[PDB]
Design a protein around this ligand. Structure first.
Ligand SMILES: Cc1ncc(COP(=O)(O)O)c(CN[C@@H](C)C(=O)O)c1O
Ligand SMILES: Cc1ncc(COP(=O)(O)O)c(CN[C@@H](C)C(=O)O)c1O
Ligand SMILES: [Cl-]
Ligand SMILES: [Cl-]
Lengths: 366, 366
């Protein structure tokens, strides 16, 4: 059996170099880095190289922190609730502005904060598919504690006017956070260009293991810890370090940025090949803008066929893709998200199987 | 080089069967369980067997939840802060009772809760080395939201009068939580005998990977989530599942309980061998009770030699142990904590190296 994985915005395959670099810390070098003997200290070099790969991966400065978390969801919860106790409760700024397209890790936590009496403006999405950057400008009152905007959307792949919103947040003097999970590995990420005080990212989206993530914190920005115990990570996130996953996530970061040119020149080209081959068929239109998109994702709608149906028939031919709410009723569309491991042959066969399914389910609808 | 690891209360070695069972989910079966295609569903059986190994490992019922967390520190933070928003803020019960020997993951979070205006009684430790169970009885006011007591101490190995305290907490109708990290693998753990509403445990203490843990929640007990997003784990802890670490932690639980008789009949006997061989030398006395201790840990003090000194000289001979504050100034003592992989030969050589060091540093003190 030869199956084709086109759902890399749900999770990615661990790169062999990553599993490679992780194995020894699951095998013989199992010491706790917080220990003082050679079993602990023995682990510090590889840890430092990992963190340096991260700093250099997002262009963070040695003055800043790149705290290692359990996942991007922990990073988002820690940002929202931390700036809640920090600014909303203890500085009055009882307002947070974000988008309606944020991951449930953001939207749901902001919903909890509304439950705590916080006023939140969820910025409406336009027809182009992204935020204007001026929506936040007209949105920032004088009691906004934070602006949170994802770097790129997980369903549509649409990049957002970050860097611009970073400049606006610097101007009005307000905290800036970006869920950058779908940006790492796809497009370059610069915390300094973005004027971001907080940045989130999850490892299993650039071919690292699930269950580890990272939160970037600019120098001087305070964030009341989500994990108390105050021993690890300058006290900001307690708990024994996931040494293996840390190392492998450093290597996953490195390999991810070393394939950026490959991601746009090759992976994006296969995206254009598949997508363009797919809209040559009756009633199918891509959801959202096509120009400012991450190279690897396309989200297309189909005739009078729900997304889950094409997911089922595609699954029966061993091709994996997700759904994605689209335009209006929702109706659910197909999200196909490539990676650096897919080939053109897989793409041709995905167009074959796709068209066969389209006329199959489309004909059976009568 | 042959080095001897006697710091299993800091972390343990991943059992080969665990790395074995984990490998495929780092290799070919990398799908996100939240996905609907065969890559996601393909992972559900091994996940279910893992969770069943956990439930059966702590004698939890199918009605209860055993939520998978990032570590025991996340579990403790989630318990304290969750019952804070649940009971202290929204039921007035602005009081929490715990011990002074709790892990910093507990004590530090309770310190944060005091910062939020919560009254906390940190129960004093006695000369026997444990809590009375009646200390909580005389401590439970009518506005206590929760009692938190570790099952066994990480520095001394002393088991605590759990089950008794569980009965007291059932009587006065108050929430009961136990940090059971040092109990798993060492002694049997029964949530039903303990009348515990919340139980914490970390995986890397029974030969699983660092960076995954578990929190047991009795049926009907509400706990406002620390991770919002509400997709995973009945919504109580969002974030993509650490499929590999979940599987391996299930197997680590299983193998841990299948070696309980070996842990007491063999590992405890090697503990008694080393410890008894060690107090035959001048001014050294074990810290705390010797009867009700986990089979694997001993904490001994030495003459006029700080603990860190013996740690250094032992490290130079490639033997790993930790410290542990003891009695009075502190002075710091030696914590040696065994595992199921140590042999008698290692113990004899640890007594040799130990005595040589004792007279070495002891003589140089003049
Ligand atoms: C009782 C107890 N609870 C919780 C923890 C922390 O577990 P995590 O790192 O997975 O959150 C520990 C670690 N102890 C080690 C640090 C020691 O005592 O040396 C512990 O002994
Ligand atoms: C932008 C973004 N942030 C955060 C997350 C969650 O990451 P963790 O599970 O490591 O916390 C995701 C996952 N997306 C997947 C679920 C999807 O869109 O299908 C995401 O796309
Ligand atoms: Cl918090
Ligand atoms: Cl909370």
């Amino acid at each position: 059996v030869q199956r084709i994985y086109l759902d890399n915005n749900a999770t990615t395959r661990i790169d062999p170099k990553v599993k490679e670099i992780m194995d020894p810390f699951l095998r013989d070098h199992y010491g706790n880095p917080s220990s003082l003997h050679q079993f602990g200290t023995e682990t510090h070099p590889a840890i430092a190289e990992a963190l340096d790969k991260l700093y250099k991966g997002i262009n963070a400065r040695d003055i800043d922190d790149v705290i290692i978390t359990s996942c991007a969801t922990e990073s988002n919860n820690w940002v929202l609730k931390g700036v809640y106790f920090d600014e909303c409760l203890k500085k009055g700024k009882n307002h947070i502005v974000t988008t309606v397209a944020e991951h449930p890790a953001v939207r749901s936590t902001c919903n909890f904060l509304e439950s705590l009496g916080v006023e939140v403006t969820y910025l409406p999405i336009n027809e182009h598919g992204s935020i204007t950057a001026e929506q936040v400008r007209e949105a920032i009152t004088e009691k906004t504690a934070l602006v949170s905007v994802m770097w790129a959307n997980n369903e549509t792949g649409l990049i957002f006017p970050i860097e611009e919103i970073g400049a606006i947040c610097k101007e009005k003097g307000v905290l800036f956070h970006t869920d950058a999970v779908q940006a790492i590995g796809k497009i370059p990420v610069d915390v300094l260009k973005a004027n971001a005080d907080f940045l989130s990212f999850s490892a299993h989206k650039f071919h690292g293991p699930k269950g580890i993530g990272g939160l970037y914190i600019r120098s001087g920005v305070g964030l009341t810890p989500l994990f108390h115990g105050g021993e690890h990570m300058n006290g900001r996130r307690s708990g024994t370090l996931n040494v293996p996953y840390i190392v492998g996530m450093g290597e996953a970061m490195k390999l991810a940025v070393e394939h950026l040119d490959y991601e746009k020149e090759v992976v994006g080209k296969l995206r254009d090949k598949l997508e363009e081959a797919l809209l040559k068929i009756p009633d199918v239109m891509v959801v959202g803008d096509r120009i400012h998109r991450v190279p690897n994702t396309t989200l297309v709608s189909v005739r009078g066929i729900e997304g889950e149906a094409m997911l089922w028939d595609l699954n029966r031919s061993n091709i994996a893709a997700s759904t994605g709410s689209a335009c209006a009723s929702a109706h659910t569309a197909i999200r196909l998200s490539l990676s650096r491991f897919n080939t053109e042959a897989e793409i041709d066969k995905t167009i074959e199987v796709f068209s066969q399914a389209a006329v199959r389910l489309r004909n059976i609808s009568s």
